[PDB]
Paper text:
We also obtained a 3.3 Å cryo-EM structure of the constitutively active recombinant human GLS2 (K253A) mutant that formed a filament immediately after the addition of glutamine alone (and prior to substrate depletion), as this mutant does not require an anionic activator to be catalytically competent. The tetramers are arranged in a side-by-side architecture and each successive tetramer is rotated ~48 degrees relative to the filament axis, with the helical rise of ~66 Å. Interestingly, in the filament structure for the constitutively active GLS2 mutant, Arg320 (which corresponds to Arg387 in GAC) forms the same type of salt bridge in the absence of Pi, as that seen when Pi binds to GAC(Y466W). The formation of these Arg-Glu salt bridges, together with the substitution of a less bulky alanine residue for lysine, allows the movement of the activation loops into a space that otherwise would only occur when Pi binds, and likely explains why the Lys-to-Ala substitutions within the loops yield enzymes that no longer require the binding of an anionic activator. An additional conformational change that occurs specifically in the constitutively active GLS2 filament structure, when compared to the tetrameric apo-enzyme, results in a hydrogen bonding network introduced by the activation loops. Hydrogen bonds that form between Arg250 and Asp400 of GLS2 appear to ‘stretch’ the alpha helix containing Asp400, causing Tyr399 on the N-terminal end of the alpha helix to insert further into the active site where the substrate binds. Following the insertion of Tyr399, Glu258 from the adjacent dimer forms a hydrogen bond with Lys440, which displaces the loop containing Lys440, and therefore makes space for the insertion of Tyr399. As a result, Tyr399 is now in close proximity to both Lys222 and the substrate, which is necessary for catalysis.
Numbering used by the authors:
A (entry chain C): 302 to 452
B (entry chain D): 152 to 452
C (entry chain A): 152 to 477
D (entry chain F): 69 to 477
Write the structure that this text describes.
Amino acid sequence: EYMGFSNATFQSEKETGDRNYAIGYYLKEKKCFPKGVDMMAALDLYFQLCSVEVTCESGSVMAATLANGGICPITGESVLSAEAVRNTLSLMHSCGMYDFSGQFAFHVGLPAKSAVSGAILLVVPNVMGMMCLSPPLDKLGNSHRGTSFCQ
Amino acid sequence: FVIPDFEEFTGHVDRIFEDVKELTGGKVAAYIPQLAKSNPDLWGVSLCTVDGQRHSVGHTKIPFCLQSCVKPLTYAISISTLGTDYVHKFVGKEPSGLRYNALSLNEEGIPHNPMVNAGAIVVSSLIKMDCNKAEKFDFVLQYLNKMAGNEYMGFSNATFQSEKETGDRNYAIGYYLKEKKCFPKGVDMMAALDLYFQLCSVEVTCESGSVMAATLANGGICPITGESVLSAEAVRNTLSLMHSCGMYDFSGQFAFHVGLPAKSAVSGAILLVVPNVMGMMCLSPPLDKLGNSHRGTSFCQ
Amino acid sequence: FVIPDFEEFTGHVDRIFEDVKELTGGKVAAYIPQLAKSNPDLWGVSLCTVDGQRHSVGHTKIPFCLQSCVKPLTYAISISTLGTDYVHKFVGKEPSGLRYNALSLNEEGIPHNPMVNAGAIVVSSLIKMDCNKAEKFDFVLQYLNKMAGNEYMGFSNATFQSEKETGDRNYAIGYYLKEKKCFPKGVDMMAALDLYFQLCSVEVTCESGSVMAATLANGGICPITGESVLSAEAVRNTLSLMHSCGMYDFSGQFAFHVGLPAKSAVSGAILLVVPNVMGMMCLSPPLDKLGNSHRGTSFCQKLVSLFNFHNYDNLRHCARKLDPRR
Amino acid sequence: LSRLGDLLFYTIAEGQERIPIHKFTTALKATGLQTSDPRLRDCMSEMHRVVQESSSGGLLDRDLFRKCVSSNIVLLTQAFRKKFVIPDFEEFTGHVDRIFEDVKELTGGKVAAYIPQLAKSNPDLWGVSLCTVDGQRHSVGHTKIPFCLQSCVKPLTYAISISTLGTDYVHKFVGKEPSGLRYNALSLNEEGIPHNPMVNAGAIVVSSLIKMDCNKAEKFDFVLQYLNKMAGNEYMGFSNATFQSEKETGDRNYAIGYYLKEKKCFPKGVDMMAALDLYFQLCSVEVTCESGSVMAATLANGGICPITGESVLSAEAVRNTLSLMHSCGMYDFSGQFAFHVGLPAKSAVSGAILLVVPNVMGMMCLSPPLDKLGNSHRGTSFCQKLVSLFNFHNYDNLRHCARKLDPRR
Ligand SMILES: NC(=O)CC[C@H](N)C(=O)O
Ligand SMILES: NC(=O)CC[C@H](N)C(=O)O
Ligand SMILES: NC(=O)CC[C@H](N)C(=O)O
Ligand SMILES: NC(=O)CC[C@H](N)C(=O)O
């Protein structure tokens, strides 16, 4: 499905994503990365991936892949292993939305991943996947309309 | 002169020098590659009265870096040029309580003091922010030479490249400060951080730095050249921070026991100051737990 | 005497006294409702030269509680009667930079310094732990009376019953210290915690308060009576902590602009000390955000800028700043 | 076999029964060989402690001196018997001083269009120093002012690589022929490598060969240790002011580095920036004419520092770099220099000329003013004049020629 790249956002985050640079150098001092691994290339890739563009239709299928045991429903390819999905969903439930991981497992109970672009990659295991877009965010860095819709 | 009996004074200094030479020390600061190269047995002391009396025992002439002893100097340089209110509008003036790394800021959103790594970058950011890198270092080096009475004022690019390629924590603080709007508008972070690494890598002997500390004791007048390098208020501020913030966490246990304005460094330097009397500097590489030389700090006590 | 021409010296203080009188702060005391009842328009100062030469202008006749200004004293009681080595086994000697409540211990598990509330409880626990509660209070009171030269020394029971029914952070600190086992063996924490409240609730006038801070401006010997209250090492030990830890977070700011050992207090007291010169005790109930009197801090700031009392003046020439005791 | 030092002292003395102590400390350096050499350091060390308890209170005595100076006996014999390779050193320095005065009148121009930290230097700064292959030294003028070693480390750093990596590995990546296209020279030879190590395009590549596996600190630290041994542990610093210049504003070098990386002319798995950064660091090393004269006297010899006698450079390294500085050291002006001077010299925008006279001596001039091609105006004149009055040209001393000063007699 649609898969682009917001270079404008990519350049807005490289030049202004100052906290993400502190973490990269903070990690580098603690030897958190593997041996013989450049942090700048790894940090840069994180900026690139965060800039990937999709639509809600593309995101919904992207979430449905996690729902259907890491097998995309509309192509059927075994793109992801069963262990990857179980590990991924079990972490979005407890770590998907950071501080709002609670108050979402509490009110919604589903593994959903929030973003500052308004998206909420909502996953219903063995049923469907859903992505809700609304740029307006609340204090905890989650979309307000999206999380109200989920509840 | 302020010490008429200087001949007997050296009789006590050398006795204490040999008294503490038997002690061992802690780690030798191996977390940056270059400083591990130093021989931990180096031990020397130099002093300079505000009249010009000078004595040296040990390895005083072996060069070493002002890895953190340049923070009071660059601070005094900034205060003397821009004014107290302007400088401290960007950097606090109170002790932090954490280590010198201290990737954190006070309630106001500015670094705690001009002696922690976060504050040393900001004061380095304030030195002639509208010029290029060569002029920035030359402006600071010019006063440092005058502080030292035109003594040996060198540079150790081996350390500068070692730190610039390995000092990742200082990069974390630099990008943390830039994210919190801790720099004046239109000022680049990397230029300030790079300048801070350059100042940290300035190489001085104990003789060069003993007169450099005696300037602060003499209050902005180099005793052996009659200069007027620093304003009276600038040194009064530097000694007020270097007292309560000079040795980081060990500021207590030093103000308690020694009660003098001193500044430590990971290279073993201790830029001791005795106001209205003299300025002393001690070199001993092997550090202690909180980032100061075991022999030097015990010698001061 | 160390201050000749006393008329000239006091005259300058009087002019500064009126100048600071216009400034108004706020937030007298969020807690201890008994302290929130004090008059915000109350402002008094007093001094006592190391040789008895004393002056006082303002509201120096109104008793006020000695909250957190007895910490440098009660520390001096323990440091002299138990030595420096024993006392600092249980309390550090470095600033915390985390306010005075500061439910936080240093790296090695002991409270940061005697001046924070966590350290004042421990040092208060060291004073005659084998005796009963009446004797523990009386033991410190006898030295406290001797420090002030048998001047006025009351006890505001109104403020002591407050700070105990409503003073809960001190209890949380007290039980926190018990969990970490940073008390001497065979000691009841509650008895030591209660002793801290009582010492805090002692009330003195500025005129009597200025006698204190002139005792320890000297080498412990009282200026009025000439007695020998505290050991000379005790005064050095506590002064070196008041400079670094006296005002808590504001210690750096105070040491920068004033550079004298001063101890803050929620009652508005500031036990300012000028070593080998005199001892000051300002009073202004309204505080700043950091727990310091707005008028008292302003007076200390202005006085140092005119009298050369800073720790790092007289470098070569500096400003004139009047005659420095010569 | 017998040690004739006892009779040698009688020759050293003027023949009188006594001599004041004051006359021995002073006026003894007239022979050129300084009193600060490490070789004779042992003599000065011991005498300082024996004076307190000697029952003479100011007498060194002959018997005591002979016993202590035992292992270093051979060196002193050549010094005072005038058996060095340059005798009558007073006349040699006397002529040198004369041209130093005469050449001082000249004035060039265009001190530095770029590297602003070089444009701040005093145009009227002029000095020279020479340290013969035997360590005999004489300096006059402003020799004590540190100056950057830009483009003088190129012959040295080339010698470092070859002596540690072989002649065939180094020259796989850099040619050995002059280019005649200035020192910047964004151009490669027919076989796709920089024309010679002396141009900027080659100096970066040879700088890339020095410990390509180590980190930045050790790469610089490796070379600086050799440069200390080459200079005999004389003054050797690092001008960070000029290193921060030539890196923010030195842009033609960056183009060469990226141009070279484009042609894949670096070794395998080597970062151009790390090699280019080292080129700026080596270029930024500051040395005085007095200290920098021992350099160009180390490689005037067969790779041994004349002062300490340490073996620092392979004789093949010195032979190769000397054969290379002659035709490529001074860029376009190499032919003009080789025509009138005919000596291995290396230019610099900081006024330095690393003059070399193999088997004889090695000089180091200093004149911040430049000529059009990037060579010091005053320094070049001294070399041209000096050769015309000392026969240092390679193709002189045919059989008898004219008198031409003393012909080794
Ligand atoms: N929602 C998010 O995790 C936003 C990530 C974003 N790249 C940031 O650094 O702030
Ligand atoms: N406190 C120190 O001595 C270290 C100084 C050095 N600039 C660093 O932060 O690594
Ligand atoms: N000055 C203060 O910090 C007040 C302390 C508080 N009254 C107590 O008893 O602990
Ligand atoms: N001609 C030279 O000496 C070159 C100077 C210096 N290496 C530069 O390229 O800027």
